């Protein structure tokens, strides 16, 4: 474990083995000293501009954390292509994490001339929250994951957390955590860190689309033996009176046929169009937004339960807060243009799932009588009903992978809404920090905590290995399937590649669901 | 025992085991050079303001010392809560001390 | 099994053992003859005051029953305090029931 | 274990074996139902007459308890005589307790005619507080111990306890105990109970008196080699000036001699006389009483630390609250006459202990100078000083035996002030109760607790066995010793015997300290 010997090698590869694929990626990182070595209380209240919906109480910390919860941390674009085009499903089995080649540096600033040198005897600290005792902040779709492009160098994100609040104030149950109250490894240059984790059994993600729909599973050529009420009134001439008539469902009355199953749950959302002209002229984004209400605070149900983005022939429409949206490269943080963002679509599930912007269905409102005409009600939110079947949201190359399932007495179908695999025991948080190095202390004792420190940062490499288990296709379909393909014709630059300026970009979102399977 | 390898790890924890609790804490420290490398005689006498009650004779030294004789050196507030709320008594049995990761 | 020998002893205690707590309680009881030795049909209908919401048909019996389905049947207040203050969870594992010292 | 067979036999005996004596006594008892089956809160406050000094908060219980903490529970008068006359010391080693021959009875009252019958199927409950979890009420010198005379039949005392109070009010730390929250044995007629206990090591009580005194341990015939300041001023004529003169202690100046030891501690008490005429005419009993002050309440220090009752030749005097006093038979509870009570005396300890009604000694008050004459102070309370030696209070045939030493961080010489042996783990409290038997319940359910019960009492016999270890005398004294003796001359009735009316009485208090031993 020398100053002069490397502690790691660079592993970035993929290997495919029948029913497994293993991915490895290595990236270079930089870690600053965060927060001036301090833990600070932060809050947001209702004074000034701030709304109640946005209040919080929390702490910010001197630590940083490692995040690889984005598919493109692990899969190259071509690899993602091999996966989606060929497999019905996949899931994660196990991972390996390595930190190595660690360099701690001190920066000296005199007279506007700045210099950087190694501090050989310096350490950094790392630990994993193996027991899940710290608030789990992965899974909230934050920035700071390993870059898609291997050549890119990245900065480690600062760690902070939230607890209960009333306005800008803490409450009795509010909790404070010190990360220094955990055991951590200390590494000098020449030391390394590693750990291994095994994923819990989780269902394969469905990289497939149904080629059948719930409302059409019958034999087109045959009648049912079952009957339905087809006529309530006589049909001939003007003297029409009530009657009862019954008919057998058949090829031309598939809508009426008796069926075994129901479409999935519905929490309806407002429809907006990409053709702006077709939209109402108000700013209705949050006012007409679909929301949930918790303890007096309102949150967008974004993106909410999975529903199809649009019905047949209407690519223009999307749910206002019902899809995942990714930025194009260098898209602005605020108020980016439609041309600067990429909207996902979940067409593939119209097959079993309600369209996002429409009713679930219709129910009776009242009791009909000779003097009372029957009335119906439109159902815009439907909870789980026996016989319902549904599909989860898709995952994307630039999307999230896993989430920690919250620790609660109950849940229904705990698949993370943003997409991915939901785990009771997800990959643990990995926290890293530069150890403080004091500048020279005073020569006579003072009890106050030291506030003068040498200025330091560290850089190193990090490796992640994941084994994924694959589910192969078993289709008897005669004709060819849809596949993700690169564009045939000439172009100014190559998709999923660099610029003349050296900027990698991902042009489109890529989903998982090209192959088909029956219902 | 290299320049480039750490000699210690950071242990700060509590474990409770029935009739024992074990506490560990780690802190970072800084030590200056004290006294210019010298031992100096010091005294306080009765001249000027000074009263008899406050007289002394002593020495000051170039050395520093480690002190962990305060309960909160070892117990977090929540830990202190588990202790006081649940036990009739406690006492100390043994200790371990480590100095590491030294930079001059 | 004599007229003159007791068939049971009075056990009312709590013992705490790490991850288990065991509670015991004993009480004295009295049982009357119920219903005059008869099973009787009972109902409530809609005549008079009575609403539909409250209708019933049933029987009443000569028997009595034992009920210990209330937490304080088993936990003393102090015991409940030790439990709630210190544990994330609890559940019931097994029970023993005894009837003794019977006098008619 | 039949209805018709006895479960115990009557054992009342003494056997002497060299260095042990074993005593057995059996008595008959009766237990009523106490408190109507209820636990009741009781308090005393400051309203009306009541003073602050007498406030309390507590509970009374349905239970009864067994008390044998009086020497005459175990020793017959003749036995006590063999013990005191012949042994330097004694202490308790172990005990056996038995309850047997139990009869539970129900009493029926109709029309002013009352009848008593057995209730064969009835039970009583017994338990020992082996773990000391209930407030220990023995050791406070209460009534209700087993009678001195074996033929007497006795009633079991009711159990009650006290906790913290403020005035008549409870405080946060006030505690409530239910005895039904302990396991107890249930016995029908024909069942029995027993247990065995071992006394912890405790020092032998001193049944001896010193034949030497602290101030006279020297050789009467020889001088000390040590000197003392004997003269501070010249003696001849009128022109007397200061000087220093030094002399050697000797036979005629024993008061001046250097010595190794000091007399025991002193908390001074007011002196009162049996000859009333010599007493001041006020009612000064509690106003001039020696007291301690705890949390704003004052209590007599009765009888307090052991000091001698009177000095030579003054039998008339006693400390106002410094001795134990016993009633003569049928003496009144309140305001009994001097002729109706028996006062103890602790003459025997004037040998090492200060007289109760006098100063410990004299100390300097100031600093003498040519212009300031020296001044002295009288010491009326003296705490422990190095070199002090002392003797404990005596024990009496009608006196207490043991006390529980309070559970505290500290104590000094934890010998109970009333006399006896102080134990961290004393003989446990034994609690007995009649089990409730309900009268007929109502024929339709009511949730209220039952308040109608059959009327019952129980009677039985109880046995205690104790082994005492003796310390034999080893005296080289030539002349005869003092001994307790029965009176030589004729008398109307025999001392320590019955009346023409069948009333046993104990005529005098008998102490333990007849034989002598050097210091």
Interhelix angle C77-86/B77-86, rounded to 10 degrees, is: 160
User: CA–CA separation, D271 vs D278, rounded Å?
Assistant: 11
Pairing of strands A291-294, A193-198: unpaired
* Percent helix, percent strand, percent coil in chain A, to nearest 5: 10, 35, 60
* Residue of C81, C85, C87, C88 to mutate when probing chain B, most B C-beta within 10 A: C85
- Buried b or exposed e, range C49-85, using 16+ CB within 10 angstroms: eeeeeeeeeeeeeeeeeeeeeeeeebbbeebeebbee
User: CA–CA separation, D367 vs D363, rounded Å?
Assistant: 12
Please count the residues of chain D: 519
User: CA–CA separation, B72 vs A115, rounded Å?
Assistant: 41
Tell me, what DSSP letter sits at residue A103? E
Chain A hits for B13, CB-CB cut-off 8 Å, are 181-183
- C-alpha distances (whole Å) from A490 to each of A303, A424, A507, D191 are 36, 47, 15, 107
- Closest residue to A437, CB basis, from B11, B32, B103: B103
Chain C hits for B18, CB-CB cut-off 8 Å, are 18
Q: What are phi and psi of D382, to 5 degrees?
A: -125, 120
Please answer whether residues A457 and A156 qualify as being in contact, where contact means their C-beta atoms are separated by less than 8 angstroms: no
Task: Name the interface residues of B facing C (CB cutoff 8 Å).
Answer: 18, 82, 85-86
Name the residue with tokens 């009312």. C12
Say which residues have a Cβ less than 8 Å from residue A177's Cβ, sequence separation at least 6.
A59, A134, A135, A161
User: CA–CA separation, A277 vs A280, rounded Å?
Assistant: 8
Name the residue with tokens 């022939």. A313
**Across D76-122, where does the E strand assignment appear?**
87-110, 113-118
User: CA–CA separation, D190 vs D4, rounded Å?
Assistant: 8
Please count the residues of chain B: 104
| Residue B21 buriedness (CB in 10 A; 0-12 / 13-18 / 19+) | middle
DSSP 3-state of A476: coil
> Cα(first)–Cα(last) distance of chain B, in Å?
15
Which two three-digit tokens encode residue A105?
A: 């540096």
Nearest Cα residue to C54 out of C41, C65, C63, C43: C43
Nearest Cα residue to D400 out of D303, D285, D294, D498: D303
For D82, the enclosing helix (H) or strand (E) is: helix D77-86
User: CA–CA separation, A251 vs A240, rounded Å?
Assistant: 29
- Closest residue to D184, CB basis, from C9, C30, C36: C9
Q: In chain A, what are the domain boundaries?
A: 1-519
User: CA–CA separation, D374 vs D362, rounded Å?
Assistant: 13
Cα D246 to the center of its chain, rounded Å: 50
Nearest Cα residue to D188 out of D434, D383, D418: D434
- CB distance A120–B3 less than 8 Å? yes
Query: What region, left, alpha or beta, does residue A420 occupy, with left being phi > 0 and alpha being psi -120 to 50 degrees?
Result: left
DSSP 3-state of D37: helix
Q: What are phi and psi of D313, to 5 degrees?
A: 75, 20
Shortest Cα–Cα distance, C92 to chain B (Å): 22
User: CA–CA separation, D396 vs D419, rounded Å?
Assistant: 9
Neighbours of D13 (CB within 10 A): 12
Whether omega for the bond prior to residue A303 falls within 30 degrees of 0, making it cis, is: yes
| Residue B14 buriedness (CB in 10 A; 0-12 / 13-18 / 19+) | middle
Tell me, yes or no, whether chains D and A touch by having 3 or more C-beta pairs under 8 A: no
Tell me, what DSSP letter sits at residue D214? G
Handedness of CA D72, D75, D76, D81 (dihedral sign): negative
Cα A10 to the center of its chain, rounded Å: 28
* Residue of A105, A180, A433 to mutate when probing chain B, most B C-beta within 10 A: A180
Give the dihedral of Cα atoms D86, D92, D96, D100; nearest 10 deg.
70
Neighbours of D88 (CB within 10 A): 19
Shortest Cα–Cα distance, C86 to chain B (Å): 8
Neighbours of D324 (CB within 10 A): 23
Q: What are phi and psi of B87, to 5 degrees?
A: -130, 140
Helices (H), A429-481: none
User: CA–CA separation, D519 vs D514, rounded Å?
Assistant: 15
User: CA–CA separation, D280 vs D278, rounded Å?
Assistant: 7
Nearest Cα residue to A416 out of A400, A430, A428: A400
The Cα diameter of chain A in Å comes to 112
User: CA–CA separation, A486 vs A493, rounded Å?
Assistant: 12
Which two three-digit tokens encode residue A517?
A: 């399977």
Shortest Cα–Cα distance, B87 to chain A (Å): 23
User: CA–CA separation, B53 vs D476, rounded Å?
Assistant: 59
Task: Please tell me which residue of chain A has the smallest CA distance to B7.
Answer: A186
Pairing of strands A13-17, D193-198: unpaired
HEC sequence for B61-100: CCCCCCCCCCHHHCCCHHHHHHHHHHCCCCCCCCCCCCCC
DSSP 3-state of D150: coil
User: CA–CA separation, D66 vs D78, rounded Å?
Assistant: 25
Shortest Cα–Cα distance, A112 to chain B (Å): 27
| DSSP-assigned beta bridge partners for residue A325 | A343
* Residue of D441, D446, D456, D458 to mutate when probing chain C, most C C-beta within 10 A: D441
Chains near A (3 or more Cβ pairs under 8 Å): B
Shortest Cα–Cα distance, B18 to chain C (Å): 7
| DSSP-assigned beta bridge partners for residue A40 | A60
Name the structure determination technique.
X-ray
HSE on the CB side for A75, CA within 13 Å? Answer: 28
- CB distance A191–B6 less than 8 Å? yes
User: CA–CA separation, A156 vs A151, rounded Å?
Assistant: 16
Q: Is residue D45 a known part of a binding site?
A: no
Chain D hits for C9, CB-CB cut-off 8 Å, are 183-186
Shortest Cα–Cα distance, B75 to chain A (Å): 11
Q: What are phi and psi of D380, to 5 degrees?
A: -100, -15
Task: Please tell me which residue of chain C has the smallest CA distance to B83.
Answer: C86
User: CA–CA separation, D209 vs D347, rounded Å?
Assistant: 9
Q: Is residue A415 a known part of a binding site?
A: yes
User: CA–CA separation, D99 vs D154, rounded Å?
Assistant: 14
* Residue of B76, B78, B103, B104 to mutate when probing chain A, most A C-beta within 10 A: B103
Shortest Cα–Cα distance, B93 to chain A (Å): 22
> Cα(first)–Cα(last) distance of chain C, in Å?
15
- Buried b or exposed e, range B87-99, using 16+ CB within 10 angstroms: eeeeeeeeeeeee
User: CA–CA separation, D415 vs D203, rounded Å?
Assistant: 10
Compute the C-alpha angle A215/A220/A222, nearest 5°: 115
- CB distance B12–A181 less than 8 Å? yes
User: CA–CA separation, D438 vs D450, rounded Å?
Assistant: 7
- C-alpha distances (whole Å) from A400 to each of A70, A86, A145, A334, D162 are 5, 21, 10, 22, 67
Say which residues have a Cβ less than 8 Å from residue A432's Cβ, sequence separation at least 6.
A31, A63, A64, A65, A66, A99, A124, A125, A126, A156
DSSP 3-state of A428: coil
Say which residues have a Cβ less than 8 Å from residue A375's Cβ, sequence separation at least 6.
A364, A365, A366, A368
HEC sequence for A223-250: CCCCEEEEEEECCCCCCCCEEEEEEECC
Chain D hits for C24, CB-CB cut-off 8 Å, are 183
Chain B hits for C18, CB-CB cut-off 8 Å, are 18
Please answer whether residues A425 and A403 qualify as being in contact, where contact means their C-beta atoms are separated by less than 8 angstroms: no
User: CA–CA separation, D1 vs D120, rounded Å?
Assistant: 13
Neighbours of A15 (CB within 10 A): 10
User: CA–CA separation, A401 vs A93, rounded Å?
Assistant: 13
Shortest Cα–Cα distance, B90 to chain A (Å): 22
HSE on the CB side for B100, CA within 13 Å? Answer: 18
Cα-trace Rg, chain A: 29
Neighbours of A139 (CB within 10 A): 20
Tell me, what DSSP letter sits at residue A159? E
- CB distance C13–D440 less than 8 Å? no
DSSP 3-state of D440: coil
User: CA–CA separation, A34 vs A389, rounded Å?
Assistant: 48
Read out DSSP for A247-286? EE--GGGGGGS--S-B---EE---EEESSGGGS-SS--TT
CATH of D1-519, one of 2.170.30.10, 1.20.1730.10, 1.10.275.10, 3.40.190.10: 2.170.30.10
Please answer whether residues A106 and A117 qualify as being in contact, where contact means their C-beta atoms are separated by less than 8 angstroms: yes
Q: What are phi and psi of B41, to 5 degrees?
A: -70, 130
- Closest residue to A186, CB basis, from B33, B36, B101: B101
| DSSP-assigned beta bridge partners for residue A266 | A382
DSSP 3-state of A79: helix
For A209, the enclosing helix (H) or strand (E) is: strand A209-210
Neighbours of D46 (CB within 10 A): 13
HEC sequence for chain C: CCCCCCCCCECCEEEEECCEEEEECCCCCCCCCCHHHCCEEEEECCCCCCCHHHCEEEEECCCCCCCCCCHHHCCCHHHHHHHHHHCCCCCCCCCCCCCCCCCC
Neighbours of D397 (CB within 10 A): 26
Nearest Cα residue to A188 out of B4, B9, B102, B103: B4
User: CA–CA separation, A509 vs A344, rounded Å?
Assistant: 7
Task: Please tell me which residue of chain B has the smallest CA distance to C85.
Answer: B85
Query: What region, left, alpha or beta, does residue A502 occupy, with left being phi > 0 and alpha being psi -120 to 50 degrees?
Result: left
Please answer whether residues D220 and D395 qualify as being in contact, where contact means their C-beta atoms are separated by less than 8 angstroms: no
User: CA–CA separation, D174 vs D153, rounded Å?
Assistant: 37
Task: Please tell me which residue of chain B has the smallest CA distance to A444.
Answer: B34
User: CA–CA separation, D459 vs D432, rounded Å?
Assistant: 11
Which two three-digit tokens encode residue B86?
A: 């649940």
- CB distance D443–C28 less than 8 Å? no
Tell me, yes or no, whether chains D and B touch by having 3 or more C-beta pairs under 8 A: no
- Closest residue to C32, CB basis, from D185, D186, D443: D443
Which two three-digit tokens encode residue A496?
A: 């999923």
Which two three-digit tokens encode residue D353?
A: 């202990």
Nearest Cα residue to D297 out of D55, D45, D58: D55
- CB distance A185–B33 less than 8 Å? no
Task: Name the interface residues of C facing B (CB cutoff 8 Å).
Answer: 18, 82, 85-86
User: CA–CA separation, D231 vs A210, rounded Å?
Assistant: 125
Give the dihedral of Cα atoms D201, D203, D205, D207; nearest 10 deg.
120
* Residue of D5, D178, D438 to mutate when probing chain C, most C C-beta within 10 A: D438
Nearest Cα residue to D328 out of D496, D488, D483, D487: D496
Please count the residues of chain A: 519
Please answer whether residues D101 and D187 qualify as being in contact, where contact means their C-beta atoms are separated by less than 8 angstroms: no
Nearest Cα residue to D391 out of D255, D254, D513: D513
């Amino acid at each position: 474990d020398g100053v002069g010997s490397s502690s790691g090698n660079w592993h970035c590869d993929s290997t495919w083995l029948g029913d497994r694929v293993i991915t490895t990626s290595t990236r270079t990182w930089a870690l600053p000293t965060y927060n001036n070595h301090l833990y600070k209380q932060i809050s947001n209240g209702t004074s000034g501009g701030a709304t109640n919906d946005n209040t919080y109480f929390g702490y910010s910390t001197p630590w940083g954390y490692f995040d690889f919860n984005r598919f493109h941390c692990h899969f190259s674009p071509r690899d993602w292509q091999r996966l989606i085009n060929n497999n019905w499903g996949f899931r994660p089995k196990r991972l390996s994490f390595k930190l190595f080649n660690i360099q701690v540096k001190e920066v000296t600033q005199n007279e506007g001339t700045k210099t950087i040198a190694n501090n050989l005897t310096s350490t950094i600290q790392v630990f994993t929250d193996s027991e899940y005792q710290l608030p789990y902040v992965l899974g909230s779709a934050h920035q700071g994951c390993l870059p898609p492009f291997p050549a890119d160098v990245f900065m480690i994100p600062q760690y902070g957390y939230l607890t209960l609040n009333n306005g800008s104030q803490a409450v009795g149950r509010s909790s404070f955590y010190c990360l220094e109250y955990f055991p951590s490894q200390m590494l000098r240059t020449g030391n390394n860190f590693q750990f291994t984790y095994t994923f819990e059994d989780v269902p394969f993600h469905s990289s497939y689309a149904h080629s059948q729909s719930l409302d059409r599973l019958m034999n087109p050529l045959i009648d049912q033996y079952l009957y339905y009420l087809s006529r309530t009134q006589t049909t001939g001439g003007t003297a029409n009176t009530q009657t009862l008539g019954f008919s057998q469902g058949g090829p031309n009355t598939m809508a009426n046929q008796a069926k075994n199953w129901l479409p999935g749950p519905c929490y309806r959302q407002q429809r907006v169009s990409t053709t702006t002209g077709q939209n109402n002229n108000s700013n209705f984004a949050w006012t007409a937004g679909t929301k949930y209400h918790l303890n007096g605070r309102n949150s967008l149900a974004n993106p909410g339960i999975a529903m199809a983005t649009h019905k047949d022939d209407e690519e223009r429409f999307f749910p206002s807060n019902g899809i995942l949206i990714f930025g194009k490269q260098n898209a602005a943080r605020d108020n980016a243009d439609y041309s600067d963002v990429m909207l996902t679509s979940e067409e593939e599930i119209k097959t079993t799932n309600p369209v996002a912007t429409e009713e679930y269905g219709i129910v009776a409102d009242n009791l009909q009588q000779q003097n009372t005409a029957p009335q119906i009600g439109t159902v815009n939110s439907q909870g789980a009903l026996p016989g319902m079947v549904w599909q989860n949201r898709d995952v994307y190359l630039q999307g999230p992978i896993w989430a920690k399932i919250p620790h609660t007495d109950g849940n229904f179908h705990p698949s993370p809404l943003m997409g991915g695999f939901g785990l009771k025991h997800p990959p643990p948080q990995i926290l890293i920090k530069n150890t403080p190095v004091p500048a020279d202390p005073p020569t006579t004792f003072n009890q106050s905590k030291l506030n003068s420190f040498i200025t330091q940062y560290s850089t190193g490499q990090v490796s992640v290995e994941i084994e994924w288990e694959l589910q192969k296709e078993n289709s008897k379909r005669w004709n060819p399937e849809i596949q993700y393909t690169s564009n045939y014709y000439k172009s100014t630059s190559v998709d999923f590649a660099v610029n003349t300026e050296g900027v990698y970009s991902e042009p489109r979102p890529i989903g998982t669901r090209y192959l088909t399977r029956n219902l």
